[PDB]
Design a protein around this ligand. Structure first.
Ligand code: BCL
Ligand code: BCL
Ligand code: BCL
Ligand code: BCL
Ligand SMILES: CC[C@H]1c2cc3[nH]c4c(c3C)C(=O)[C@H](C(=O)OC)c4c3nc(cc4[nH]c(cc(n2)[C@@H]1C)c(C(C)=O)c4C)[C@@H](C)[C@@H]3CCC(=O)OC/C=C(\C)CCC[C@H](C)CCC[C@H](C)CCCC(C)C
Ligand SMILES: CC[C@H]1c2cc3[nH]c4c(c3C)C(=O)[C@H](C(=O)OC)c4c3nc(cc4[nH]c(cc(n2)[C@@H]1C)c(C(C)=O)c4C)[C@@H](C)[C@@H]3CCC(=O)OC/C=C(\C)CCC[C@H](C)CCC[C@H](C)CCCC(C)C
Ligand SMILES: COC1=C(OC)C(=O)C(C/C=C(\C)CC/C=C(\C)CC/C=C(\C)CC/C=C(\C)CC/C=C(\C)CC/C=C(\C)CC/C=C(\C)CC/C=C(\C)CC/C=C(\C)CCC=C(C)C)=C(C)C1=O
Ligand SMILES: COC(C)(C)C(=O)C/C=C(\C)CC/C=C(\C)CC/C=C(\C)CCCC/C(C)=C/CC[C@H](C)CC/C=C(\C)CCC=C(C)C
Ligand SMILES: CCCCCCCC/C=C/CCCCCCCC(=O)OC[C@@H](O)COP(=O)(O)O
Ligand SMILES: CCCCCCCC/C=C/CCCCCCCC(=O)OC[C@@H](O)COP(=O)(O)O
Ligand SMILES: CCCCCCCC/C=C\CCCCCCCC(=O)OC[C@H](O)CO
Ligand SMILES: CCCCCCCCCCCC[N+](C)(C)[O-]
Ligand SMILES: CCCCCCCCCCCC[N+](C)(C)[O-]
Ligand SMILES: CCCCCCCCCCCC[N+](C)(C)[O-]
Ligand SMILES: [Fe+3]
Lengths: 303, 281, 241
């Protein structure tokens, strides 16, 4: 019956927090939204405000057009039958042009041309969203760590849909837009390149993906374990180390022989996560361009 | 040697067994009864691996592989060279991992902190036991467990997966992957957010947690809050491992076909299975 | 045979070694250099060097933090060695709860309140926080507070709330002499008829360190309160039967 601070016992509510202004153009910031008692059991209850602005509107417009170009194609693959649509929803796929079209933009609409159009909309949606993660931090005087971490994810996505297909010579190498089909694409990619288990950058990517769960479990549990000393107030703990920061460090020093600081655990954290897609993107980029067969390659280089 | 602030925390107490008998440190490491237990289990398990490597004829860590018994041994004991070493090493590993968790418990007690960390570590242990104990017992043979080898246990993953076609279609596996990807996304975002407030633009005072909330509200319309994000990180990572264990404990025990068949239920529902066109009619 | 994939993977592992070296030194900005158990610098500091100083400019005129920098506990530590060799416990010389050692430890933080981004006190009693109220769950105000000796130590008279995070952080508890103490929210179990506090017996509630102002709490005071209460799990434990 010792409380665990996983769910809130007593929720409290006051006036909506409108937020810091700094250099944010308040003209592009929405009103505040309603409060969610449901969310309040686990985190904050307040919804909104949200920032709009040119980049966000462009990203949202472009991202919805991506989504709609795929939807329209699904409706056409379903013969416009709504029940066929719901039935095969996970089986439809907007496929890239066939290999004979190379990198040409002359693939007919129904045979890859719509894939290129959807990809254009997706490309604008992601890069304008990236610009937004940078500008939202700038407007508040904050560091640019979010935009930089986001670039690591974008890197893997750029490699999969754009850079590797270009270096391979055809859009046909790109990932299709479908629930199951992109899973089939992923399995096929490994079989075609001689087992991605033996791509060392893929093994690293796994180490960092497993390590991200290891580390967030460690850190999430650690902070809850010292929440009885205000441990989740990490910025003031960085500015003015408290017994929460000290007990957290000593738990780990006594357990495994070394430890973090309140600030430095977040450098471990950001690097553990971004290295997932950083190494992952490298491993995919080398596949087929440089290495046709990872298992064979590994045997000739010592694996 | 101590951290500059450490001495005031190095008091007697908090042990679960043995009183003050093992209540001391070796350098930075706390010992305790379960530190002794960890050492014994780990040292013996490592000795037995060395024994297995001697029987194998290699000292190469990339080649050493300790295999479980052949399937024909069922759940029986096997001779050392033919699965017994794997069996004893598995007992030692379980012994070392559980002792590690209980040592952490003692550490939590001496420091007066919550028990969230060994509780979270227990999920990893249970996922390990799912693969070497729970699932092999339910299938009837130790030989369904994975071998202890750097590359051979990856081949086991691939052999086990492709037994069921494309393992992607395992639905608990989809949920587990979604928790793993979402966890890494949240870890990147959380690390970036704190660092972006502690290390603001040049020429700026350190930001406050209000700036963190404002940043995420501006960006996506919601901030889970500083307590919420650590709750979330723990939930995502533990849910990933829970659904990992679930996706394997059902595979070969209550599901035997190609996993892609599971969704075929949705496909062949009588009211739309025979409509021409699309994919499934 | 040493192709581009080879060059890339060996390069990444070199990068990774440098990153780990960097990350470890970054995490030595607190608590290092290591000390002997007598407080003097330890001869063996390990293979990683101390990081070069960095500076944080604190908002609200609060000054600047430089880390690493010269460290001191800035408080007396009522503990003595139990051994001449290293690695053994240091035993409390007095009352470890009152002296703030072991799991009752506190850190000499700033004797000022944490402020929000607008420079206002982050934590306020609900009676001073216009519009704040219990919005879900059992409202604990007016309930009796029970210790691990199953006896009643006082009455909940207010909730101290983190305003920016809209979170209950402390229960203000009125004792039989009419004074109050703060009880950390993470150390109470709010029930239908009572608030149960397993960490403290009823007679230890008045030992909770007091706050010097009725409407605010300083970081120093929060550390003394939170340390004292958590210390009860070990030091009030002979009363938990
Ligand atoms: C989890 C689901 C599968 C599985 C699927 C995969 C796949 C797929 C991959 C790995 C990879 C690895 N796995 Mg495996 N792995 C399993 C179970 C295990 C267990 C275990 C006791 O359960 C262990 C110790 C390992 C260990 C390892 C490492 C050799 C490597 C990097 C992991 C990592 O950084 O994780 C996160 C953890 C950390 C960052 C913390 C540090 C962990 C260190 C590196 C562990 C060293 C273990 C040591 C070599 C063996 C025991 C040492 C004893 C002293 C004898 N696996 C099961 C069977 N594993 C990758 C690889 O490169 O393999 C060659 C890879 O591609
Ligand atoms: C049969 C299948 C093959 C195989 C084929 C592949 C292939 C092919 C790939 C991987 C990749 C990965 N694999 Mg593998 N994989 C196998 C076996 C494994 C095993 C295992 C237990 O055996 C494990 C643990 C893994 C694990 C991993 C990950 C470490 C890695 C993906 C990282 C990531 O975050 O991607 C997810 C993150 C992203 C895709 C980035 C996304 C960023 C963009 C910008 C997001 C856009 C959002 C968009 C606009 C939509 C918005 C929606 C609105 C919000 C509503 N694989 C086997 C051998 N694997 C990838 C990799 O890096 O390989 C080196 C990869 O390409
Ligand atoms: C890494 C190697 C492979 C790959 C291998 C796998 C495997 C294997 C699995 C997935 C899984 C998923 N992948 Mg994939 N995946 C790849 C690249 C992508 C890209 C991309 C931009 O490149 C996208 C958008 C997705 C999207 C998705 C989701 C459908 C799902 C959960 C992801 C997740 O946890 O996100 C974390 C992010 C968030 C939680 C934020 C919100 C994200 C939302 C939900 C994304 C919506 C996308 C899409 C528009 C949804 C339409 C739904 C209905 C059809 C209308 N993948 C590459 C090519 N992916 C899992 C799954 O369930 O598959 C069915 C799974 O098992
Ligand atoms: C060809 C292979 C198949 C496939 C077949 C399988 C099989 C088979 C399995 C998985 C499992 C998993 N797969 Mg799959 N998988 C494929 C493709 C993928 C892709 C992808 C992008 O395509 C992804 C992301 C995944 C993802 C995943 C995870 C959901 C899960 C692994 C994590 C886990 O269980 O941790 C759990 C964590 C542990 C087991 C670690 C335990 C650690 C212990 C407690 C402590 C060790 C201490 C150590 C010895 C100390 C050393 C010394 C110190 C370091 C000093 N797979 C393809 C389609 N996958 C596995 C699973 O769910 O397992 C339950 C599994 O068995
Ligand atoms: C290792 C790095 C990890 C990572 C990092 C990362 N991702 C990030 C970031 C970072 C640091 C961001 O800053 C950024 C972000 O903003 O996060 C909150 C992002 C983000 N990562 C995302 C997704 C994502 N990340 C993933 C992975 C990871 N990201 C890695 C694990 C994955 C996968 C496959 O695992 C996914 C799916 C997004 C949540 C976000 C990027 C947002 C973006 O680019 O959006 C562009 C698109 C739109 C604005 C709109 C698209 C339209 C919708 C699909 C509409 C559907 C609903 C409905 C039809 C609406 C109808 C309305 C009608 C009224 C018209
Ligand atoms: C549940 C969420 C995630 C999680 C959580 C987690 N792990 C944890 C903790 C937590 C909260 C700890 O407190 C604990 C720790 O101290 O971390 C620093 C731990 C830890 N997780 C570890 C590893 C680890 N965690 C993993 C995963 C995860 N850990 C999950 C994704 C993985 C993988 C593969 O994904 C690995 C490899 C260790 C760093 C540590 C546990 C240390 C420990 O138990 O030490 C005692 C034992 C020894 C020192 C050695 C024992 C040797 C054996 C007797 C012989 C070898 C047997 C083994 C089966 C051989 C395998 C060979 C491989 C090639 C397959
Ligand atoms: C806010 O707080 C926080 C901190 O603090 C301020 C922290 O530190 C940490 C901790 C996190 C880090 C320090 C980041 C780095 C961590 C990782 C990258 C995770 C992976 C960790 C490892 C691979 C290290 C593993 C080392 C182990 C398992 C110990 C090795 C064991 C020995 C060499 C000997 C073990 C001692 C024994 C056997 C017990 C008894 C000893 C005898 C001799 C007997 C977190 C989470 C935190 O959130
Ligand atoms: C009710 O129905 C309506 C019609 C209203 C709908 O809207 C329904 C909508 C749906 C059902 C949506 C269905 C959507 C999906 C199934 C999405 C699934 C997507 C994935 C699983 C993601 C797969 C991976 C995608 C990747 C890797 C894309 C890479 C993109 C490239 C990096 C971009 C490259 C750019 C190109 C090729 C164009 C070049 C042009 C330039 C200007 C550079
Ligand atoms: C050829 C293959 C190489 C990879 C190709 C490009 C891939 C793009 C990836 C980008 C790097 C990964 C993210 C960096 C780590 C996370 C951010 C970080 O910790 O550093 C940023 C930090 O200073 C703060 O920024 P400022 O506020 O501007 O100082
Ligand atoms: C064994 C030691 C040497 C290993 C071999 C040589 C290493 C080769 C390459 C390694 C370099 C990896 C460095 C990664 C981290 C880069 C430092 C960094 O991040 O700088 C920016 C930072 O200041 C400001 O960040 P913020 O304060 O967060 O804005
Ligand atoms: C009116 C607008 C409608 C509202 C739409 C709701 C969308 C919610 C989406 C994601 C929340 C999960 C965020 C997970 C990542 C958080 C990173 C972090 O550290 O947050 C800490 C906290 O937010 C500060 O300290
Ligand atoms: C706003 C749309 C963005 C277009 C960029 C991608 C070009 C697609 C070309 C499709 C070709 C169709 N057609 C008939 C010319 O063959
Ligand atoms: C930022 C955290 C650093 C953690 C580094 C983890 C190293 C794991 C080693 C995995 C080995 C992968 N591979 C294929 C190259 O052998
Ligand atoms: C693979 C990720 C683990 C990286 C390990 C970093 C080890 C750092 C050990 C530093 C020793 C600390 N000490 C005891 C000298 O203070
Ligand atoms: Fe944190």
């Amino acid at each position: 019956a010792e409380y665990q601070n996983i769910f809130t016992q007593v929720q409290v509510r006051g006036p909506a927090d409108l937020g810091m202004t700094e250099d944010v153009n308040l003209a592009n910031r929405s009103g505040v939204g309603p409060f969610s008692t449901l969310l309040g059991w686990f985190g904050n209850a307040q919804l909104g405000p949200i920032y709009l602005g040119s980049l966000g509107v462009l990203s949202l417009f472009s991202g919805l057009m991506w989504f709609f170009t795929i939807g329209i194609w699904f409706w056409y693959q379903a013969g416009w039958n709504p029940a066929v649509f719901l039935r095969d929803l996970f089986f439809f796929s907007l496929e890239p042009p066939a290999p004979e079209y190379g990198l040409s933009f002359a693939a007919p609409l129904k045979e890859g041309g719509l894939w290129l159009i959807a990809s254009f909309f997706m490309f604008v949606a992601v890069w304008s969203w990236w610009g937004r993660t940078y500008l939202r931090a700038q407007a508040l005087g904050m560091g640019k760590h979010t935009a930089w971490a986001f670039l690591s994810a974008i890197w893997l996505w750029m490699v999969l849909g754009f850079i590797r297909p270009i270096l391979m010579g055809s859009w046909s190498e790109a990932v299709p837009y479908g629930i199951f089909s992109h899973l089939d694409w992923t399995n096929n990619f490994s079989l075609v390149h001689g087992n991605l288990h033996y791509n060392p950058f893929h093994g690293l990517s796994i180490a960092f993906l497993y390590g991200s769960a290891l580390l967030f479990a460690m850190h999430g549990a650690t902070i809850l374990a010292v929440s009885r000393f205000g441990g989740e107030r990490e910025l003031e703990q960085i500015a003015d180390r408290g017994t929460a920061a000290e007990r957290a460090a000593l738990f780990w020093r006594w357990t495994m022989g070394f430890n973090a600081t309140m600030e430095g655990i977040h450098r471990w954290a950001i690097w553990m996560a971004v290295l997932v897609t950083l190494t992952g993107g490298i491993g995919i980029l080398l596949s087929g361009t440089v290495v046709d067969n990872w298992y064979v390659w590994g045997q000739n280089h010592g694996m | 040697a101590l951290l500059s602030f450490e001495r005031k925390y190095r008091v007697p107490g908090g042990t679960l067994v043995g009183g003050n008998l093992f209540d001391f440190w070796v350098g930075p490491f706390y010992v305790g009864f379960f530190g002794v237990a960890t050492f014994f289990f780990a040292a013996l398990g490592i000795i037995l691996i060395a024994w297995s490597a001697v029987l194998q004829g290699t000292w190469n860590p990339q080649l050493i592989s300790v295999y479980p018994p052949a399937l024909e041994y069922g759940l029986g004991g096997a001779p050392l060279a033919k699965g017994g070493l794997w069996q004893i090493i598995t007992i030692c590993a379980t012994g070392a991992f559980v002792s590690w968790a209980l040592r952490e418990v003692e550490i939590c007690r001496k420091l007066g902190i919550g028990y969230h960390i060994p509780f979270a570590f227990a999920f990893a242990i249970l996922a390990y036991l799912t693969l070497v104990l729970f699932r092999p017992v339910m299938m009837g043979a130790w030989g369904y467990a994975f071998p202890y080898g750097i590359w051979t246990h990856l081949d086991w993953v691939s052999n086990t997966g492709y037994t069921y076609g494309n393992f992607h279609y395992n639905p608990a596996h989809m949920i587990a992957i979604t928790f793993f990807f979402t966890n890494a996304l949240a870890l990147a975002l959380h690390g970036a957010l704190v660092l972006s407030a502690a290390n603001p633009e040049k020429g700026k005072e350190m930001r406050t947690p209000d700036h963190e909330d404002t940043f995420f509200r501006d960006l996506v319309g919601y901030s889970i809050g500083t307590l919420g994000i650590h709750r979330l990180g723990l939930l995502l990572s533990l849910s990933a491992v829970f659904f990992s264990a679930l996706c394997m404990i059902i595979t070969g025990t209550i599901w035997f076909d190609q996993w892609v068949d599971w969704w075929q239920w949705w496909v062949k529902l009588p009211w739309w299975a025979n409509i021409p066109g699309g994919i499934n009619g | 045979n040493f192709d581009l994939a080879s060059l890339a993977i060996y390069s990444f592992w070199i990068f990774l070694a440098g990153l780990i070296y960097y990350l470890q030194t970054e995490n030595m900005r607190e608590g290092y250099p290591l000390e002997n158990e007598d407080g003097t610098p330890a001869a063996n500091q390990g293979p990683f060097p101390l990081p070069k100083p960095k500076t944080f400019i604190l908002p609200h005129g609060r000054g600047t933090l430089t880390v690493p920098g010269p460290e001191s506990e800035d408080r007396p530590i009522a503990l003595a060695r139990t051994a001449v060799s290293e690695g053994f416990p240091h035993a409390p010389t007095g009352d470890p709860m009152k002296d703030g050692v072991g799991p009752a430890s506190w850190v000499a933080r700033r004797d000022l309140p944490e402020l929000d981004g607008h420079g206002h006190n982050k934590i306020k009693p609900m009676k001073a926080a216009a519009g704040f109220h219990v919005s879900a769950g059992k409202n604990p105000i007016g309930l009796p507070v029970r210790g691990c000796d199953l006896e009643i130590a006082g009455k909940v008279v207010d909730i101290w709330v983190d305003i920016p995070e809209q979170m209950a952080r402390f229960l203000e508890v009125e004792l039989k002499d009419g004074s109050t103490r703060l009880l950390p929210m993470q150390m109470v179990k709010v029930q239908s008829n009572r608030v149960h506090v397993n960490a403290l017996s009823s007679d230890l509630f008045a030992g909770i360190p007091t706050i010097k102002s009725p409407t605010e709490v300083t970081l120093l005071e929060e550390d003394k309160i939170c340390g004292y209460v958590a210390g009860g799990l070990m030091y009030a434990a002979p009363k938990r039967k």
